[PDB]
Design a protein around this ligand. Structure first.
Ligand code: ADP
Ligand code: ADP
Ligand code: ADP
Ligand code: ADP
Ligand code: C5P
Ligand code: C5P
Ligand code: C5P
Ligand code: C5P
Ligand code: MG
Ligand code: MG
Ligand code: MG
Ligand code: MG
Lengths: 211, 211, 213, 213
């Protein structure tokens, strides 16, 4: 399986870029079991929160941007099995309640796997599993604007709590943990999903692999 | 009169820095006519909008961040008279209605004048009237967060229109017109009003001038 | 119609080497001159002819070869336009050692893909719109200054102190004022220049696909 | 208690010259050694003693003098602490030419104001908290590389290629990893280094005020 790692800051466009790639590849018109290109999100691997942690999260006082927030062991284990051509089950994360669902997603063997997340390149062992590394680079202020609108209409958050959480944990964590991984990227994609030339370049490359 | 120019991006903390300086100098406990240090805002010199312009402004589709948005002639004329020790009248701008008020402010001769604005260093003639140039440097994302809260509670704006206006005009104008003037600053003050050491340095310097 | 790819980046960013590598990997350095499917055009080939006093200053590293005015922008646009029309063009040959245009020229026959590289390839809107793909080779300024020093001393017969003087006085200011503002027009940013094998192979594959149909 | 001012910035940013200018303008280069009211301490005075193989590597520009481990951080903290206690201290003298600590030393008597400058002056939290004011001299990396090259060749007897190698391999990476992250701790940022007369006079006036009472 050809693994492509995608990173970038929060709301940089990582998710929309991956979605557009599979969409342009016609994967949305293919049966779930027949998909040749699948998208795996790092957010699906957020650790289960403890009572105290969830309490803070509800107040926007928990650091979901720190490397420890993700179950790195599970991520590595899952990606390795995928590279081995095995079928795996991945967790389903609910941003609204800061928790997992009892339902999991079946990830069948695909020819190409897109793994995206704010800290997809943080771990060296994970990084070495990617045959290609893309980093979506979008200005911090632009990303904040996007996150505010997205979080309010999709993650059930409030403006003030969003800005507070962002300035207190998100911004600092981005500079300390995310930004430093940009150097590992092979190709930088500015702006995001509206960058059609960049997206089509990845699509053609993937299509070439499928053939 | 000792003129101090202060610039920086929107919501960088220019206004709060100047306010804190005069506050620490005890100027808030001095009668209006007796003030030795006065603050002049560049926003007071926004040009009067035409019908079409105001219509766009209401939609957040007018560029208030472009150099042309300010009456540069009036600014230069006013600052020159101030350097001449003359009493002048300055306009009063209402951000809520995107317009001036019929009432003006009397600016009496002061020993020290603080002139602050996003484009205070844009004009060379104006820039040369400043004996000291300060630039308040605060990260773009941090400034956006501040502007959103400020604009909503002080300028009668709506979140969506604020983000739209910011991404469409504010951000581009900052990079093209404001940021390039940072090189003219003598001293850079990071973060803003919470930077007590920096503020106290300016206060002591001004106090030295007053003596 | 020819597929034009614009490539920019600061001096010594790796632009030239990246383009050379791509063309080499495409096996074009084997194809007949008149059968070339992928060619490279350099913006430096269009540097203007210097006058007597200009060349004198250049000999002292006192001429600004980094300002848009240093290039014959009209000739660049006309040439690119003629290329998109499938016409054979004549390109000048520049000599960095003598700061002059050589008498010898390079004829470029109709190609399927054209790579145009230069420190200011994205400066002109008209030129930019002629590119179907825009790549920016991003390499830190301090890294590029190191590379430029070694290159100019060993290849362009320049003196160390003159290189640093020229760099601080003209190269750096012009890059920040005229080149940096154009980075936003690039579709893809390529780091580590010529050593970025993944990025290079990606472009090669894309071009090979365009050639196949 | 002595008023400590920490000063940082990358190599050749103008840190040393700024501090020297301030002290000169304060008329301290006239005051008796034992009557000095304002003194300057350099972090480079605390570079560690190199072993046989370390010095050999250093002679080839293969040793990392930019990593926090290159300095005797404990001696720095102890010395600063003793200074804040109003005690007379003994400071080592470093020789950049031989990569070694000299046998001669500089005695620093109780001062009212102390300037501590170094490429990593803000790296240690304990050290940072000892500063009542933190200044960062911000000068672009390419500008600093140019200055460093000229300085090392003419003052530290280094070879051009070795300087560039050392810079790309250690100086640049260490600056970005260890120094840049500390810039956020500075209270005031000073651009244009030693040529910034306004900023320098501002600091001088502030210090003179502290001395007057
Ligand atoms: N070009 C664009 N213009 C406007 N909104 C955009 C653009 N690209 C992305 N967005 C919006 O930004 C938000 C975050 O994008 P997303 O793709 O989820 O990024 P990430 O995966 O990096 O967090 C979404 O609400 C998305 O619709
Ligand atoms: N350190 C700070 N922490 C939180 N909010 C701040 C801080 N500094 C400024 N602000 C807020 O940011 C907004 C913009 O600051 P302002 O001083 O008006 O800046 P400017 O004059 O540059 O537009 C205000 O609502 C202000 O209260
Ligand atoms: N990975 C690398 N490491 C060190 N030097 C390099 C590297 N890649 C290129 N160079 C050197 O950098 C100089 C400029 O590279 P070049 O490809 O011509 O860039 P540009 O076209 O942007 O000027 C050359 O002298 C080249 O040998
Ligand atoms: N304005 C300037 N223009 C050119 N060179 C300068 C300037 N200011 C300082 N330099 C040179 O830069 C080098 C380093 O300056 P220095 O003050 O020692 O900085 P730092 O203490 O940060 O290493 C010296 O060789 C000095 O002569
Ligand atoms: N429960 C959770 C889990 C993650 N997050 C935020 O989600 C982000 C990562 O997702 P994106 O890449 O979709 O922005 C982080 O920056 C983290 O702040 C959250 O706000 N609440
Ligand atoms: N009528 C007006 C006039 C100015 N402005 C905005 O006010 C800003 C400048 O003020 P601050 O420095 O207070 O942020 C600009 O960035 C401009 O966008 C506005 O939003 N409506
Ligand atoms: N005669 C000339 C013409 C150009 N140049 C320099 O050549 C550079 C562009 O070449 P590269 O793209 O090969 O780096 C410019 O930065 C310009 O300074 C020069 O140093 N002498
Ligand atoms: N023996 C030594 C000790 C330090 N250094 C360099 O000296 C620098 C710090 O000096 P400045 O602050 O004077 O620039 C570092 O960047 C370190 O590389 C050296 O080149 N040889
Ligand atoms: Mg996402
Ligand atoms: Mg304001
Ligand atoms: Mg070339
Ligand atoms: Mg020193």
């Amino acid at each position: 399986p050809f693994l492509i790692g995608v990173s970038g800051g929060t709301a940089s466009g990582k998710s929309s870029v991956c979605a557009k790639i599979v969409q342009l590849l016609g994967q949305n018109e293919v049966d779930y079991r027949q998909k040749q290109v699948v998208i795996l999100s790092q957010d699906s691997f957020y650790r289960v929160l403890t009572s105290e942690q969830k309490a803070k999260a509800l107040k926007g006082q928990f650091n979901f941007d720190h490397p420890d927030a993700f179950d790195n062991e599970l991520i590595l284990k899952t990606l390795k099995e995928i590279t081995e051509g095995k079928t795996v089950q991945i967790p389903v994360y609910d941003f609204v309640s800061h928790s997992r669902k009892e339902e999991t997603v079946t990830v069948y063997p695909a020819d190409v796997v897109l793994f995206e997340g704010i800290l997809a390149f943080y771990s060296q062992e994970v990084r070495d599993l990617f045959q290609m590394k893309l980093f979506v680079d979008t200005d911090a202020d632009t990303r904040l604007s996007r996150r505010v609108l997205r979080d309010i209409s999709e993650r059930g958050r409030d403006l003030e709590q969003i800005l507070s959480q962002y300035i207190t944990f998100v911004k600092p964590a981005f500079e300390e943990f995310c930004l430093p991984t940009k150097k590992y990227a092979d190709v930088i994609i500015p702006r995001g999903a509206d960058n059609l030339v960049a997206i089509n370049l990845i699509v053609q490359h993937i299509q070439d692999i499928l053939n």
